[PDB]
């Protein structure tokens, strides 16, 4: 006999079994090490996707500056990714979109974003995945680097009493001109501090510092206020709303065209969405946007772009040496690889000499591109602009298109009345996309009739819309308290159920699994169990003193009482009236040495 696990796709659909193809969600064990090799390949492919050779030495660094925008050359082999953008077509698409949506659209959105920012406290910047310290030269959460920056400002030129985003930004600006800066002790000069502020580290997802953070947040807020009004913008949210958008689009399409046309769908996957987005086009676009608004926003939105036009990239850990038998092994940093180039292999050599020009000490002056997972909203806006295109050449032929676009994934819907004009429309669309760097893959982008397609793992079909974005919590990595991590997980499971990524039995299984994970994390078990752990010792003696075992807390030899219909309700609220009054008051005693405010916190 032979067990071929795949023969169940014949007499069944795919929207029901595709989930079995991918492993379960979680932290992957792949752990790829960002090191010198990969970063240099990235920089090389970046400079190459620029199809030009022009340069202009600067005056603040005495370094060339590859200006790959509006200077397209090397037209040959245009199938591959391109990065040279044309400003005329960009502004034309922006004008088309404005005309469609309305005149005072960009103005209204920028005004809303402004007013929202005004009442904002700079402390918000503490809410971030991670950043890069410019003093310790490492990666840390936002709060740490923020405290470092503020205390350095204090130590050098007095405290920062603004307590607002705008004063923070102006303080950063002023600091760009300070000649000497101190920090706990040592100081630095102007050029070094500038570099450090424009430094980036590979986590090769980017990890910028703190100076540019607020301006990026502002630009993202504006782009978000914009993407909400757009029908074809599935980035800000997903699931129920996403399916609503899908079906609205499909129904409008079906009700739009006539009996003579026949439609088609396409599953597209933009390749190198980070190595072809240029901040110069973003700057020109933001300028065209704020053209009629307070000059304040005009200048503000023009900060992060230029900050990304000049971004030093921190090369990873340097190469290592070794003798033949490998009994001896030397270790060198990146800044000195230009000192031993005669030893490194060719493939590693040919990838290093052409860039030595742009190196200063240990970094590479990347003048463009967009590596961070930032400006995703803005890239999505640009894509939507691409999709809102229409002219008379198409109308004459009786064809058009439409669709939906995520950050770097999209779905197209072409329309025509012939099995050939569809090809012409597809080629027209690909050309207009490449005009501004937005490329497409060929080994990962397919298409077929309208019934079947895919978008953000939501494999749509004639029916049976199947999702695959099942998320889960993780206690060991994020340990907070024994009274929050369970409620948060319950809320998460509820959400996943809302998005249809989970079903009743699946949700119950996940709940009974997360409960055990929680217990094992905080090293707690019920009372029925015959365990001998430390926390259980006392619980193994002070347990007979109570009768409301149901009311007991999970953190204290308790048992579960919540279920599907009782997730929004924390176990505490569900056991309050049931906990023996003694234990109850013993928990809710604000006179203790230490969401629901319990006597279970781990400060």
């Amino acid at each position: 006999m032979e067990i071929n696990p795949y023969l169940m796709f014949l007499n069944n659909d795919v929207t029901s079994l595709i989930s079995t193809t991918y492993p379960y969600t979680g932290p992957p064990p792949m752990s790829h090490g960002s090191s010198t090799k990969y970063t240099l390949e990235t920089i090389k492919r970046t400079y190459d996707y620029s199809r030009t050779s022009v340069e202009k030495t600067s005056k603040v660094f005495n370094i060339p500056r590859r200006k790959f925008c509006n200077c397209l050359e090397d037209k040959d082999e245009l199938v591959k990714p391109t990065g040279n953008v044309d400003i005329s077509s960009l502004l034309g698409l922006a004008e088309m979109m404005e005309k469609r949506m309305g005149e005072g659209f960009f103005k209204h959105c920028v005004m809303e974003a402004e007013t929202e920012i005004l009442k904002m406290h700079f402390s918000r910047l503490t809410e971030g995945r991670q950043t890069y310290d410019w003093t310790s030269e490492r990666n840390m959460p936002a709060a740490t680097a923020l405290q470092l920056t503020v205390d350095a400002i204090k130590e050098t030129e007095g405290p920062f009493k603004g307590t607002t985003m705008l004063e923070y930004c102006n303080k950063m600006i002023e600091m760009l001109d300070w000649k000497e800066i101190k920090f706990k002790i040592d100081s630095i000069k102007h050029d070094e501090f500038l570099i450090r502020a424009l430094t980036i580290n590979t986590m090769a997802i980017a990890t910028p510092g703190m100076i540019v953070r607020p301006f990026s947040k502002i630009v993202e807020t504006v782009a978000q206020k914009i993407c909400e009004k757009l029908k074809e913008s599935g980035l800000p949210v997903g699931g129920n709303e996403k399916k609503a958008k899908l079906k609205t689009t499909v129904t409008s399409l079906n009700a739009r065209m006539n009996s003579d046309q026949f439609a088609v769908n396409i599953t597209g996957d933009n390749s190198k969405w980070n190595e072809c987005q240029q901040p110069e086009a973003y700057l020109a676009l933001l300028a065209y946007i704020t053209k009629d608004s307070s000059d304040l926003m005009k200048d503000l939105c023009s900060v992060a772009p230029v900050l990304f036009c000049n971004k030093f990239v921190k090369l990873g850990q340097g190469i290592r040496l070794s003798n033949k038998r490998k009994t001896k092994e030397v270790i060198i940093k990146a800044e000195k690889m230009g000192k031993y180039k005669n030893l490194m292999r060719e493939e590693y050599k040919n990838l290093f000499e052409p860039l030595e020009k742009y190196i200063q000490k240990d970094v590479c002056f990347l003048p463009g591109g967009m590596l961070m997972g930032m400006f995703n909203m803005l890239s999505t806006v640009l894509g939507v602009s691409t999709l809102c295109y229409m002219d008379e050449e198409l109308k004459a032929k009786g064809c058009f298109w439409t669709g939906l676009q995520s950050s770097d994934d999209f779905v197209l819907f072409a329309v025509a009345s012939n099995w050939s004009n569809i090809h012409w429309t597809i080629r027209r669309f690909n050309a207009v996309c490449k005009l501004i760097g937005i490329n497409m893959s060929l080994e990962k982008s397919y298409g077929s009739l309208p019934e079947l397609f895919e978008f953000t793992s939501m494999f749509f079909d004639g029916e049976f819309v199947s999702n695959l974005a099942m998320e889960l919590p993780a206690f060991t990595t994020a340990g907070v308290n024994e009274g929050v991590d369970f409620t948060a997980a319950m809320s998460i499971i509820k959400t996943n159920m809302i998005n249809n990524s989970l079903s009743p039995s699946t949700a119950l299984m996940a709940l009974r699994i997360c409960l055990q994970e929680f217990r094992a994390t905080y090293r707690v078990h019920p009372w029925d169990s015959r365990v001998k752990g430390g926390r259980m010792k006392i619980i193994n003696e002070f347990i007979k003193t109570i009768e409301n075992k149901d009311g007991l807390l999970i953190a204290d030899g308790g048992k579960l009482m919540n279920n599907i219909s009782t997730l929004h309700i924390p176990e505490e609220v569900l056991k309050f009236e049931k906990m023996d009054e003694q234990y109850r008051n013993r928990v809710f005693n604000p006179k203790n040495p230490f969401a629901v405010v319990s006597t279970h916190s781990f400060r």
Binding site: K537, F576, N585, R586, F588, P593
Partner: protein, 599 residues
């Protein structure tokens, strides 16, 4: 070790000693300190403040508690609730839970139609007394329909809801019809035309032959399926044209297949699939079946059969200007290629109405006839028998319900064992106090419960039960609960063998001494109760110590003793090779360990 931070004065003011029981607890501190603080520490009364502050959460809890949960149902698409929409309705399922509104009419309709289906099925057990047994079932079936205790002889008439079962049961009452038809689950209707019956043959396996009937003239009808309208015309065993106005893939596919069978169009009415030859059984247990319903049943097995049927219908390449009104193999609205004589559109086809009532005539197979044949209903167009709990119902005539299951058998046996007590001579307590256990092995109730016992290894079960009984009686230490639990096994003769720790019935269930189980459970502080699948039963007597002595109800030749961890864990088998004065630990359940000593 002590990652958790704390306050200092807050610690001493609470008098928290370190290493209370070798647990440091600590400025810094451990986590167990929280345990020690919430188990032995200061007492406040701040509940009201907490509730007031968390009013939103506790009001959500109250609202939740203010729900009347209803049933759920699998189906598709043709603020206070937003907090729960996740648990209220998905996409394949939905729950009709309500808050304040109540109106019991459509549930009553579902109940009445279900019971009508049930009764009409029950009448399908003979060959001659169909109508008689049917009508007698009706007259012997009453219901607490809604709030009124009405009978099932007027609801079928007072109601106005077309259905195969309503009509099939009302025709026997000479009730009015609405000219509606029922070919399987689908609903049909005539619009124009007419014809006469005609017979033809169809082969099976390529050698045999079977006769079916059809119509030879032209006639238009109005088909209708779940969320799917249609219109078509049948002519000479073949489908001429058809149109649809309800857009769904599965609904349209099944409706088209059913209308095709209704028109008998296709080659599978000339020959048959190789799947039919597997059976060739156009017959019930002892009855006959036509070819159409056999084909239908073959469809219900798998959608591949549906696709094969549809391929039998000619497929062609669509021409321009028709995509908007074409179709696909999978119900696709438009496609470069479609099927012959098809038309898709939007908007449901308005259904006509017939205001002419009539009465039909039932047959041996209960098939009703209005005129010119034209069967309107039958049992063949019904689902298979589906057991469903019926409430607000009274069914008195025999065949009402089997009401016989192994579970209920065991329940009744145990009820008899309990009642036998009877607080009198020649009953459980008198024989106990007399120490006459042998008679217990001959009572009638154990003889009635014997058939429910696993036959293959009943001797060893009886041996063990007879051991426990005697060892608990002679000494005078016993527990009525475990006794009654094991008694049904003390009927057959004892034999040698290997016992494991469970007593198995014939229904694959089991029972175990010294533990509780769904079939049989009990506990102290409520010893006057005995649960059976949650059904609490009462004891005709009262006891406060007759049960407290279970030292002999766990094992056969052993007795519980004081706990001792030094004693080694063992199994139920090695017990044979133990001696005296030799304590031994052993599991008595899930994570339940106890010490035992021989004798």
């Amino acid at each position: 070790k002590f990652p958790i931070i704390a306050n200092k004065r807050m610690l001493e003011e609470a008098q928290i000693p370190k290493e209370h029981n070798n647990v440091a607890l600590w400025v810094l501190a451990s986590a167990s300190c929280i345990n020690y603080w919430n188990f032995c520490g200061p007492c406040v009364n701040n509940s009201e403040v907490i509730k007031e502050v968390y009013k939103s959460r506790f009001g959500r809890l109250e609202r939740r508690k203010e729900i009347m949960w209803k049933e759920l149902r699998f189906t598709l698409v043709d603020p206070e609730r937003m907090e729960l929409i996740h648990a209220l309705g998905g996409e394949t399922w939905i729950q009709e839970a309500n808050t304040a509104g109540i109106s019991n009419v459509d549930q009553r309709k579902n109940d009445i139609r279900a019971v009508c289906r049930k009764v009409c099925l029950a009448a399908n057990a003979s060959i001659m007394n169909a109508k008689s047994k049917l009508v007698e079932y009706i007259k012997s079936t009453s219901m607490r329909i809604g709030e009124t205790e009405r009978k099932l002889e007027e609801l079928i008439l007072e109601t106005d809801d077309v259905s195969p079962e309503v009509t099939l049961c009302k025709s026997a009452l000479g009730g009015q019809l609405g000219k509606t038809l029922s070919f399987g689950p689908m609903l049909l209707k005539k619009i124009s035309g007419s014809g006469v019956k005609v017979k033809d043959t169809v082969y099976i396996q390529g050698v045999r032959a079977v006769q079916f009937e059809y119509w030879s003239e032209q006639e238009e009808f109005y088909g209708e399926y779940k969320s799917a309208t249609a219109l078509f015309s049948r002519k000479e065993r073949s489908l001429e044209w058809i149109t649809i106005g309800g857009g769904i893939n599965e609904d349209r596919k099944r409706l088209l297949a059913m209308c095709m069978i209704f028109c008998r169009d296709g080659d599978y009415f000339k020959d048959a699939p190789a799947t039919i030859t597997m059976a060739d059984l156009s017959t019930k247990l002892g009855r006959e079946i036509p070819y159409q319903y056999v084909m239908m049943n073959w469809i219900q097995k798998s959608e591949d059969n549906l696709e094969a049927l549809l391929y039998s219908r000619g497929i062609v390449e669509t021409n321009p200007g028709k995509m908007g009104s074409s179709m696909g193999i999978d119900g696709s609205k438009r496609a470069i290629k479609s099927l012959r004589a098809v038309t898709i559109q939007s908007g449901k086809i308005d259904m006509p109405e017939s205001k002419e009532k009539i009465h039909l005539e039932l047959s041996d197979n209960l098939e009703a006839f209005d005129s010119s044949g034209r069967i309107v209903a039958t049992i063949l167009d019904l689902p298979s028998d589906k057991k469903v709990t019926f409430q607000d119902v009274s069914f008195q005539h025999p065949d009402l319900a089997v009401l016989r299951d192994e579970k209920t058998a065991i329940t009744k046996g145990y009820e008899a064992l309990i009642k036998r007590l009877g607080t009198g001579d020649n009953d459980i307590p008198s024989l106990i106090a007399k120490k006459d256990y042998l008679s217990l092995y001959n009572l009638p109730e154990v003889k009635l419960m014997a058939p429910l016992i696993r036959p293959n290894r009943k001797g060893v079960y009886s041996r063990v039960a007879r051991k426990l009984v005697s060892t608990q009686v002679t000494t005078g230490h016993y527990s009525l609960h475990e006794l009654i639990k094991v008694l049904p096994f003390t009927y057959f003769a004892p034999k040698q063998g290997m016992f494991e720790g469970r007593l198995f019935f014939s229904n694959d269930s089991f029972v175990e001494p010294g533990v509780n189980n769904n079939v049989f459970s009990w506990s102290k502080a409520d010893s006057s109760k005995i649960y059976c699948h949650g059904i609490a039963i009462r004891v005709p007597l009262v006891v406060g110590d007759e049960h407290m002595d279970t030292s002999l109800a766990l094992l056969e030749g052993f007795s519980v003793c004081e706990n001792d961890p030094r004693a080694p864990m063992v199994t139920r088998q090695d017990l044979i090779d133990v001696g005296f004065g030799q304590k031994v630990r052993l599991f008595v359940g899930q994570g339940s360990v106890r010490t035992f000593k021989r004798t």
